[PDB]
Design a protein around this ligand. Structure first.
Ligand SMILES: Nc1nc2c(ncn2[C@@H]2O[C@H](COP(=O)(O)OP(=O)(O)O)[C@@H](O)[C@H]2O)c(=O)[nH]1
Ligand SMILES: Nc1nc2c(ncn2[C@@H]2O[C@H](COP(=O)(O)OP(=O)(O)O)[C@@H](O)[C@H]2O)c(=O)[nH]1
Ligand SMILES: O=P(O)(O)OC[C@H]1O[C@@H](n2cnc3c(OP(=O)(O)O)ncnc32)[C@H](O)[C@@H]1O
Ligand SMILES: O=P(O)(O)OC[C@H]1O[C@@H](n2cnc3c(OP(=O)(O)O)ncnc32)[C@H](O)[C@@H]1O
Ligand SMILES: O=CN(O)CC(=O)O
Ligand SMILES: O=CN(O)CC(=O)O
Ligand SMILES: [Mg+2]
Ligand SMILES: [Mg+2]
Lengths: 431, 431
């Protein structure tokens, strides 16, 4: 399919940055359509590591045009910080990156508010990444936020910037008894970068309509994961954007009917960073082994990630929400050596019922229990394996089992961090 | 196609409630996926008028199951008010209506805030419908809002309700120097209706996944119109939800790939209620004639609607944003008698350029001018006409012209308020 979507089927960090970089060798565009710099996408090329946050993952490929679509809440400070770092490394970001004039802007008061609210919640804090994501969306939705378009006229921008900060500053000093955010530092920092930021603007929806018609290959790069979806996630322990496939259109302007293939990034074991329900969570040698073996540490905040077994019930909700076409099994090399592995196949509900669909809101997951199928692990190494033949039967069986339980083929398998330690059984672009 | 979407291609009020009711004769479900009770959908059956706001438009058809999906911000007060009215008229709402536990709740403080903010803006007020839509979305996105799910445990709901109102009450009395909203009246009014509201809950995304697989016919009913889309609309003179086709999935849980046909409701002349750019706006006998002949008055606030010529440039943006399959021409009978009619074919940009794509943010539409094609009107009456043969050539030519300029067939034509005063040239469900 020409229009390929690559998103996280779990709670983020499944390995989307790596697969996006891999698959784009044939792409004209890579588009980010939600989240902001809360995302941490690790790319490893010949052992050279790269972590992207706001810049899309096709930025290393000279042939790809990277696009930050309207759904992304854009932090000028973060954009600029990352642009400089990548430029120093011989990556001409300004030449490859384009951005939507409809993207809301994340500014410092957004971080003050995020922080503020996060303190206010006390023990019931969301565990947000401390970037100002939430607040920037609230503002968006509220129709008081600023967007890349507002920079088109500096005078009015200061006018508009002055009101909003005034507004947010009253709440911060008077309500959270917080320190105020300086209107003048924000105006200055921004104006320092406007012209560069402004030069990368393009009518993204019109560009994609044109790309669609030329039959160009387009790749949409998700951020976060299905269960963090503001609507369908474990509310309120979620992110503020729709991380599910439906956010592709709203977040870029491409008619929903132009989504040809939806690749679900599936990790092989589960992880979460932030608070929130997590049925298959492991608090023992084995989960400890998972974190350690998979080096599960937040690529954005550095926080240690919670690990658990693969939850096929949770995953089955992603299949339906995202109309998955196929899965990409990531980090199988991490399950290497375990005597046995297991899959959550159903949930024991606190009232006694055995169920196979997941609760919606966080509160409703409260006392849910997992029913697991236990399978043989494997001692042979699968690390770097580029062929299934190189995969031990137990691995193949596990693979087969995930397919059986979900009804979606696993079209790609990832056996390591490096771009090339992958098996493409079926390339989404082909069909 | 089994999954049919019916949305507004302009600024709302194109005639969606009527077409939804018409087309559902063959549907199993009708799903609302965004907006709340800001919508005003008029149905006319044998001359009996019905105006829906929050209840979907398939509620009059005994065979259809009406669903309020997660994207809709749900007002218990409005639901209950409308349920009672429809019940008194022999319509057993509780038997036909289902709703998502993931829908945020609109409560009185949401109206106080909407009002508050609307006053704060002064002359630059959005012209919001005075229902608490904006605030309920802000809360949603902020992760502090309440949802149908929170009513599942009354104790914690009061706990949760108490914090939020406290929060909103500080801002209202201290910042807007507004009157506070009484926590106890809100808790009581709500608890009075919880049990009824609660009984209509169902896992909407799972239901649609199951419906999809059974091949059942599903109709998604949009609210508002394309140019009011929070992202792609004339920001900030927009509504707070994505009114574009991409909001179907995020707002219901159906994978985006299951959208088979997207019907664009197209009015034949343009209207807007609320502030915001409007290039083809008419301030003369003819616009006056349009309002009067089309009885263009807000079906929700009663406000007079602004009228203008059909804007093919604006419409062409809806075609791409929504991946339209076909159009439904509505209110052609209203253009009857005019000596001549006209279509905006391009925009003269304030810097001299002739352009055919629309600006994004409101500020950018500021000095845009329309280039029109002027066409022969017609004296013959098209009112109630059920066949094209009954349409005069000038009408047919106009029709043909809209197709030529947009590239999308007009699959249905509406010649009046009543369900039956319509021509279905191509039924979306068939293909
Ligand atoms: N061992 C192993 N590490 C992988 C594999 N695929 C990706 N990684 C690493 O696993 C982590 C994925 O985390 P992150 O980069 O935050 O995920 P993203 O947000 O989905 O891009 C990164 O450290 C990747 O380098 C794999 O197949 N095996
Ligand atoms: N004259 C005429 N009125 C129509 C036609 N179709 C619908 N209407 C009326 O036009 C108005 C459409 O407004 P509204 O109900 O708010 O639109 P909706 O929000 O799209 O459902 C209503 O008063 C309808 O009764 C038509 O073909 N001709
Ligand atoms: O307001 P927010 O900052 O968005 O936080 C809300 C919640 O969502 C989590 N979170 C945010 N970004 C995440 C990410 O990005 P990638 O997978 O794209 O690398 N991966 C995993 N979890 C992520 C936070 O940990 C928190 O629980
Ligand atoms: O916060 P809001 O109350 O949503 O207002 C924001 C803006 O959007 C407009 N508006 C809201 N609902 C509308 C509607 O519903 P239907 O077409 O479905 O019948 N039709 C037309 N315009 C509508 C308001 O007039 C205002 O400019
Ligand atoms: O890659 C994303 N992270 O794991 C999220 C974070 O750092 O919190
Ligand atoms: O039918 C919807 N209206 O025209 C909106 C309003 O009443 O403001
Ligand atoms: Mg990550
Ligand atoms: Mg209406």
């Amino acid at each position: 399919g020409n229009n390929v979507v690559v998103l996280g089927t779990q709670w983020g960090d499944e390995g989307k940055g790596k697969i996006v970089d891999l698959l784009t060798e044939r792409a004209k565009y890579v588009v980010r359509y939600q989240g902001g710099h809360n995302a941490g996408h690790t790319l490893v090329i010949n052992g050279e590591k790269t972590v992207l946050h706001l810049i899309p993952s096709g930025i290393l490929r000279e042939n790809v045009t990277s696009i930050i679509g309207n759904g992304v809440v854009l932090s000028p400070a973060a954009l600029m910080k990352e642009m400089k770092e990548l430029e120093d490394r011989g990556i001409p970001v300004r030449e490859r990156l384009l951005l939507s004039e409809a993207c809301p802007l994340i500014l410092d008061y957004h971080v003050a508010l995020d922080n503020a609210r996060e303190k206010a919640r006390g023990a019931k804090a969301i565990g947000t990444t401390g970037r100002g994501i939430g607040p920037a969306y609230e503002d968006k939705v509220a129709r008081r936020g600023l967007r890349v378009g507002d920079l088109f006229d500096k005078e009015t921008f200061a006018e508009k910037l002055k009101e909003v900060m005034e507004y947010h500053n009253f709440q911060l000093v008077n309500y959270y008894k917080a320190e105020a955010v300086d209107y003048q530092k924000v105006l200055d920092d921004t104006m320092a970068v406007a012209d560069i930021l402004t030069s990368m603007v393009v009518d993204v929806s019109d560009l994609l309509d044109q790309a669609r018609q030329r039959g160009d290959f387009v790749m949409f790069e998700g951020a976060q994961g299905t269960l963090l979806d503001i609507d369908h996630g474990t509310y309120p322990y979620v992110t503020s954007s729709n991380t599910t496939a439906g956010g592709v259109a709203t977040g870029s302007g491409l008619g929903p009917r132009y989504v040809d293939y939806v690749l679900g990034i599936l990790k092989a074991y589960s992880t979460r960073v932030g608070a929130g329900p997590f049925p298959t969570e492991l608090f023992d040698e084995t989960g400890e082994f998972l974190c350690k073996q998979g080096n599960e540490f937040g690529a954005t905040t550095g926080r240690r990630r919670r690990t658990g077994w693969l939850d096929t019930v949770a995953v089955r909700r992603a299949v339906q929400l995202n109309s998955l076409s196929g899965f990409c099994l990531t980090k199988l090399d991490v399950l290497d050596g375990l005597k046995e592995v297991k899959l959550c196949v159903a949930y024991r509900m606190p009232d006694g019922r055995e169920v196979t669909t997941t609760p919606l809101a966080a509160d409703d997951w409260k006392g849910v229990e997992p029913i697991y199928e236990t399978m043989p692990g494997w001692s042979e190494s699968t690390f770097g394996v580029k062929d299934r033949s190189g995969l031990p039967q137990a691995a193949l069986n596990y693979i087969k089992r995930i397919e059986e339980l979900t009804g979606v083929p696993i079209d790609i398998i990832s056996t390591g961090p490096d771009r090339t330690e992958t098996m493409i059984l079926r390339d989404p672009f082909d069909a």
